[PDB]
Design a protein around this ligand. Structure first.
Ligand SMILES: Nc1ncnc2c1ncn2[C@@H]1O[C@H](COP(=O)(O)OP(=O)(O)OP(=O)(O)O)[C@@H](O)[C@H]1O
Ligand SMILES: Nc1ncnc2c1ncn2[C@@H]1O[C@H](COP(=O)(O)OP(=O)(O)OP(=O)(O)O)[C@@H](O)[C@H]1O
Ligand SMILES: Nc1ncnc2c1ncn2[C@@H]1O[C@H](COP(=O)(O)OP(=O)(O)O)[C@@H](O)[C@H]1O
Ligand SMILES: [Mg+2]
Ligand SMILES: [Mg+2]
Ligand SMILES: [Mg+2]
Lengths: 394, 228, 219, 384
């Protein structure tokens, strides 16, 4: 009824928002700064207080000390090296050698110790964040879930049942099978359930251009790993990071093997990782090096194969629990139609079988819609199917 | 990457015969029951087309008037072995003027079952149930693509084999009768089958101590269907 | 001058080094394999002469090397490609180890698993003197090693390490150690306190890590 | 700026009137609320007084820096352009949220303290691999296929335009789409009509140019590529001719196939990684479908497999009609003799014959295209 009367009384106050919010001050869209209404702590005091008494305190690196006296030996980025001193504010206790310290530009004396270098590409592969994958969602391989989970979390959640019994729990475990079987998807439930540092590693990210370059990245990874008390290190697709040593004639695949040898050394030998648990997963395990496959590094050895019948029916009940369907279908018929089949294929059949109901104008799929999925996904894509030379893992 | 056909598993067993264990799982399901009254036997057809003639396919085929068989897995390979069994019975009768016993049939096929190689080629993708009535009354056997065989009382073989065995152990006992055994089988068949049960989806054959091996047809069959 | 241990990697090669580290009260020094590998050139070389110079200072001192194959790869001639920089450091390892101006102050303990990788120039006679292999434990040592690792557990006297080492052929100290821990977990699964023989028997089954496929149709 | 997200009556109602009237009174409250602050606290201008107080803090030689760590109490280690890094402190006008390792910041000339942060001048490659405009005409340009076009809209366009259908179904769209067939069968041509149709940020990359001469530069290029694809929007990543990573070996690659392998491994991660993927679609196309790794082709990585057959002859005449639509055809010709000339001609062949025939007319300055133009034209195009 009041067509313009709602529109302009709308519009003059939608504008009058901005017409006084410019008179507040949010404006002068910047080049990298902050809101003018926020910074006013450093306004009259820290502008000459966090600035004018404050130094630059250029950071350095300690070489070593000497006896009887401080007479410290400093080192900087490019320039020369000095004999330097502490400040009074610090003890000479935590002034150990090979340490970064904040140092004045004039007297060249030590102010505060610093943490060492972390190499932030290693920092990036800390995940910081958990996925949503439930152990309810990897149903069908519950014995593998149990046999893994009894290794992964049970000392971390209960470090007393192993101690008072008097056994040290294992540290290493690989997971392997054909692709799409639930290896990576299974790892996501661990990264879900967990709490500590979950540092993921994909081996092809270690492929470097320089020599020894990934090998130091390994070292740093174990440095910040040894900083944390308990830490879980994830290894995905480790066939890139190493099969074995086979060298003959011109040195082929030399560079990868040395990093693999560093990975051996960081795993076993001379006061090791302690409370750092590892977890590999491959596709084809047959390529892998035997000393890598030595226990003490890769103790638990979990297989992932296809489910028998009931795990498959359970996977039907996993992906199929949340879709509009005919009420009176049965899945055991479909599992009979899927002998050699992964749960990814089961999910793909679920998602295609919905699309059949999406084809004309149906809301819920039927049994024969599922049958329309079966021949296409199973039997029409049967030229590809990707599995059988991975069943033998070649 | 290509191994030989006579290669043992790292587990010890094989690869390809073990693959034939996988291959027979795709076949149509089959149920035979040995009752002291006599052995009943049933199988589905896995009907495909309306334009398909249904009776052209079957899995019941007999060897003798007291011996029939049930097949699964692959099909076209089996009839060779069927011919070998029939030939064997005719040799045994030819030289002994008596019927070869069902077990002695079963070992005779089972010796043939693993003979392939690279002299003189591949194993066989079938699964076999052996019905007969010897002098020891009703007999029912089950053999293997490995050639390993056994006597069973009620064996379910095919795609729904393991699920029907669980539903079968709970209902079978030693003191069954044939009339309840037939309907008892056809209930589980109607469960495990895809299409709606009629007189064309399935077919039966029984062997009795009294009469011969008899094969049912769609005239005496649907009474069990309406009286399931 | 120069001892070398080689064999299967589960034979225990680190274990001797950390044993003797507890034994001698001398300057123990250890090395990683690819530790002498740098992005820039000559830094591993200087890194070598810093180590032998420091061990030159410490006149009672032995040096350990783990995984020599990372650097000790046999040389090759090839155009167009082929690394050199590792073989530089390998050469100062050869000479700076031995040759011009020798010394008798340091002893070299080296560990590897594979021998054919190695340039024979480090396998001459006197750069590496005593080359010893580590065979697999025969049977009695297999009883002895799980007897070693079976120490800190509640063990009921249901154990026969002679039976265990006879039903466990072809194992190493890592695997025989692993049967001990896995039996140490199976009994925690059944909640028992002491140990029985079948706990070991099943731990063997896990250490062997067989593929289950429905085999009951034999014999 | 994001003051009220509610519009739901959408009529002439006293609801939508009272909305604004409420927010009218609130915005007048903000106006006369701030109006008293300068009325009884002039004391400054506050529009440039505190602002040039900040600009009187920060010096004009603003050195450009780069982060490498963060300590929360407004000081950190910051790297110089020379490399000799410091341990300066951070200001209060730095709006401490846009601070990630490796970012460019603003430093003092004197004490090098963290003055401000710097917006990053995009990336040369993002624009290079980023497709700007729609290439060409719509799906009506193609003709003849009419089935898999429904497949492509099904997996791609319909998820975009109608996100109601998957939700009433209880389902998510299929992930990976692949295209394969004989060469010249319109494989790229369909993707052009997709790039016409979509509004999403579109990326296109040949499978040939993945390979590098540096070790790991391929997989690094992959990781930053999927970084670029994820960081933008509902994006469409297209790959053409992915077989070329497996077919041809080049001597620029220092590594052999055992670097190509690692490249395909890192890509294989980026299809099916455990990380939260987001709204990125993957369209692939090649002609040698049998050659590559089937592990990339598993469901979970690719859901839809789309073959392109050779054209049938009644579709051929349609393709002739398309490639002869706007041209001054002299009526001397018969297209049906042109259909059965080759039994297995492609859609590239028809357009090649048509365009080359136009070249023959422009040899003779003509405007219409005669029969002998096609006669010698197919001699030029086919037989050599
Ligand atoms: N047991 C299962 N239940 C439900 N879904 C499964 C299961 N196993 C696999 N999937 C499906 O497979 C897809 C891929 O899983 P995952 O990435 O773990 O495969 P994988 O075994 O790691 O092989 P790859 O390393 O090649 O990915 C997931 O999207 C998931 O939907
Ligand atoms: N069905 C068709 N209708 C109209 N034009 C077509 C058709 N098929 C191919 N063409 C013409 O052929 C040209 C080549 O198309 P496109 O490059 O997409 O085929 P392709 O199979 O991707 O080729 P390639 O195999 O070389 O990648 C297109 O520009 C198009 O005009
Ligand atoms: N008595 C023993 N004999 C052999 N091996 C043992 C013995 N006791 C323990 N071990 C195992 O030997 C391992 C030593 O590691 P090692 O085999 O030296 O690694 P590598 O030889 O690959 O460098 C230890 O992890 C330990 O579990
Ligand atoms: Mg995976
Ligand atoms: Mg060692
Ligand atoms: Mg093309």
């Amino acid at each position: 009824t009041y067509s313009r009367q709602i529109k302009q009384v709308e519009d003059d106050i939608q504008q009058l928002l901005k017409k006084i919010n410019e008179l507040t001050g949010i404006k002068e869209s910047d080049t990298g700064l902050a809101p003018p209404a926020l910074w006013d702590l450093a306004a009259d005091k820290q502008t000459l207080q966090s600035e004018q008494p404050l130094q630059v305190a250029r950071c350095t690196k300690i070489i070593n000390a000497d006896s009887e006296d401080p007479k410290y030996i400093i080192n900087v980025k490019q320039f020369a090296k000095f004999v330097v001193d502490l400040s009074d504010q610090v003890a000479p206790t935590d002034i150990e050698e090979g340490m970064r310290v904040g140092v004045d530009r004039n007297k060249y004396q030590i102010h505060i110790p610093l943490p060492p270098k972390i190499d932030p590409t290693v920092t990036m592969m800390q995940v910081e964040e958990k996925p949503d994958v439930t152990y309810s969602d990897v149903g069908g391989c519950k014995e593998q879930i149990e046999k893994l989970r009894e290794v992964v979390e049970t000392p971390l959640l209960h470090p007393e049942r192993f101690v008072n019994l008097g056994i040290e729990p294992p540290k290493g475990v690989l997971l392997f099978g054909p692709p799409g079987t639930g290896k990576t998807l299974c790892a996501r439930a661990v990264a879900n359930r967990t709490d500590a540092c979950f540092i993921r590693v994909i081996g092809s990210e270690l492929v470097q251009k320089y020599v020894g370059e990934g090998a130091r990245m390994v070292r740093e990874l174990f440095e910040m790993a040894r900083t944390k008390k308990a830490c879980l290190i994830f290894f995905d697709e480790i066939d890139a990071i190493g099969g074995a040593r086979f060298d003959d004639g011109a040195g082929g695949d030399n560079e990868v093997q040395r990093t693999m040898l560093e990975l051996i050394n960081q795993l076993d030998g001379f006061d090791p990782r302690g409370n750092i648990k590892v977890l590999m997963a491959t596709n084809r395990p047959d390529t892998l090096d035997p000393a890598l496959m030595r226990p003490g590094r890769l103790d638990r050895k979990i297989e992932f194969s296809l489910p028998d019948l009931e795990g498959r029916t359970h996977i039907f009940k996993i992906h199929a629990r949340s879709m509009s369907v005919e009420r009176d279908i049965r899945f055991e018929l479909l599992a009979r139609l899927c002998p050699n089949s992964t749960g990814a294929e089961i999910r793909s059949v679920c998602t295609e079988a919905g699309m059949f109901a999406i084809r004309a104008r149906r809301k819920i799929a039927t049994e024969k819609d599922f049958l329309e999925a079966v021949n296409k996904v199973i039997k029409s894509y049967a030229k590809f199917s990707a599995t059988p030379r991975y069943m033998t893992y070649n | 990457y290509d191994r030989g056909v006579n290669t043992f598993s790292p587990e010890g067993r094989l690869f390809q015969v073990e693959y034939a264990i996988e291959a027979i799982k795709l076949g149509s399901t089959a149920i035979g029951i040995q009752t002291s009254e006599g052995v009943c036997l049933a199988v589905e057809k896995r009907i495909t087309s309306p334009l398909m003639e249904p009776s052209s396919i079957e899995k019941i085929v007999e060897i003798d008037a007291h011996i029939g068989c049930a097949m699964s897995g692959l099909i076209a390979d089996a009839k060779t072995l069927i011919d070998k069994a029939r030939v064997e019975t005719q040799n045994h009768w030819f030289t002994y003027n008596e019927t070869m016993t069902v077990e002695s049939v079963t070992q005779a096929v089972s010796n043939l079952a693993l003979q392939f190689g690279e002299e003189d080629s591949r194993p066989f993708g079938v699964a076999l149930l052996f019905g007969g009535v010897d002098e020891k009354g009703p007999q029912l056997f089950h053999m293997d693509p490995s050639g390993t065989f056994v006597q069973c009382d009620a064996r379910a073989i095919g795609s729904a084999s393991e699920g029907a065995q669980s539903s079968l152990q709970e209902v079978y006992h030693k003191s069954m009768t044939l009339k309840e055994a037939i309907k008892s089988s056809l209930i589980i068949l109607k469960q495990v089958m895809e299409e709606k049960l009629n007189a064309t989806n399935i077919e039966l054959a029984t062997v009795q101590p009294g009469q011969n091996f008899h094969m049912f047809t769609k005239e005496e069959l649907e009474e069990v269907i309406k009286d399931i | 001058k120069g001892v070398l241990m080689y064999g299967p990697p589960g034979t225990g090669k680190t274990l001797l080094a950390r044993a003797c580290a507890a034994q001698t009260k001398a300057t123990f020094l250890k090395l990683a394999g690819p530790q002498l590998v740098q992005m820039f050139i000559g830094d591993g070389a200087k890194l070598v002469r810093d180590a032998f110079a420091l061990a030159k200072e410490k006149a009672p001192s032995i040096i350990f090397i783990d995984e020599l194959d990372a650097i000790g790869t046999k040389r090759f001639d090839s155009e167009k490609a082929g690394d050199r920089e590792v073989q530089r450091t390998m050469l100062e390892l050869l000479n700076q180890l031995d040759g011009f101006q020798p010394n008798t102050q340091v002893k070299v303990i080296a560990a590897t698993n594979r021998v054919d990788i190695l340039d024979p120039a480090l396998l001459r006679s006197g750069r590496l003197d005593r080359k010893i292999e580590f065979p697999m434990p025969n049977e009695e040592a297999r009883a002895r090693i799980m007897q070693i690792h079976s120490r800190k557990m509640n063990v009921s006297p249901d154990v026969n390490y002679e039976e265990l080492a006879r039903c466990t052929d072809d194992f190493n100290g890592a695997q025989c150690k692993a049967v001990c821990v896995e039996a140490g977990m199976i009994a925690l699964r059944r909640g028992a306190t002491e140990l029985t023989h079948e706990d070991y028997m099943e731990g063997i089954l896990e250490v062997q890590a067989k593929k289950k496929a429905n085999l009951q149709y034999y014999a | 700026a994001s003051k009220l997200p509610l519009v739901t009556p959408h009529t002439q109602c006293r609801l939508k009137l009272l909305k604004l009237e409420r927010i009218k009174d609130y915005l007048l409250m903000e106006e006369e609320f701030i109006r008293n602050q300068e009325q009884m606290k002039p004391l400054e201008e506050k529009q440039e007084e505190e602002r040039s107080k900040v600009d009187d803090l920060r010096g004009t030689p603003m050195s450009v820096g780069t982060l490498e760590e963060i300590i929360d109490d407004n000081h950190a280690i910051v790297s110089t352009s020379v490399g000799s890094e410091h341990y300066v402190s951070i200001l209060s006008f730095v709006d401490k949220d846009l601070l990630e390792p490796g970012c460019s910041v603003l430093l003092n000339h004197k004490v090098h303290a963290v003055i401000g942060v710097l917006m990053d001048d995009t990336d040369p490659l993002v624009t290079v691999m980023k497709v700007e405009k729609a290439p060409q005409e719509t799906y009506a340009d193609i003709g003849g296929l009419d089935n898999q076009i429904q497949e492509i809209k099904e997996s791609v366009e319909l998820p975009l335009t109608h996100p109601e259908y998957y939700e009433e179904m209880g389902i998510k769209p299929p992930k990976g789409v692949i295209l394969y067939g004989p060469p010249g069968t319109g494989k790229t041509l369909l993707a052009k009509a997709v790039a016409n149709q979509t509004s999403a940020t579109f990326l296109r990359v040949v499978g040939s140019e993945l390979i590098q001469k540096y070790l790991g530069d391929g997989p690094k290029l992959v990781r930053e590529l999927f970084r670029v694809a994820e960081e933008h929007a509902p994006s469409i990543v297209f790959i053409d001719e992915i077989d070329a990573i497996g077919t041809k070996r080049y001597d620029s690659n220092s590594g052999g196939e055992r670097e190509i392998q690692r490249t395909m491994l890192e890509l294989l991660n980026q299809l099916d990684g455990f990380d939260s993927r987001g709204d990125v679609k993957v369209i692939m196309a090649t002609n040698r479908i049998e050659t590559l790794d089937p592990a990339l082709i598993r469901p979970g990585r690719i859901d839809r497999k789309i073959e392109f057959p050779l054209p049938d002859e009644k579709t051929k005449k349609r393709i002739f009609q398309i490639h002869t639509s706007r041209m001054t055809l002299a009526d001397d010709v018969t297209l049906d003799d042109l259909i059965m000339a080759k039994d297995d001609l492609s859609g590239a062949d028809i357009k090649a014959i048509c365009t080359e025939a136009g070249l023959m007319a422009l040899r003779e300055r003509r405007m219409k295209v005669t029969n002998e133009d096609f006669k010698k034209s197919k001699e030029n195009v086919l037989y050599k």
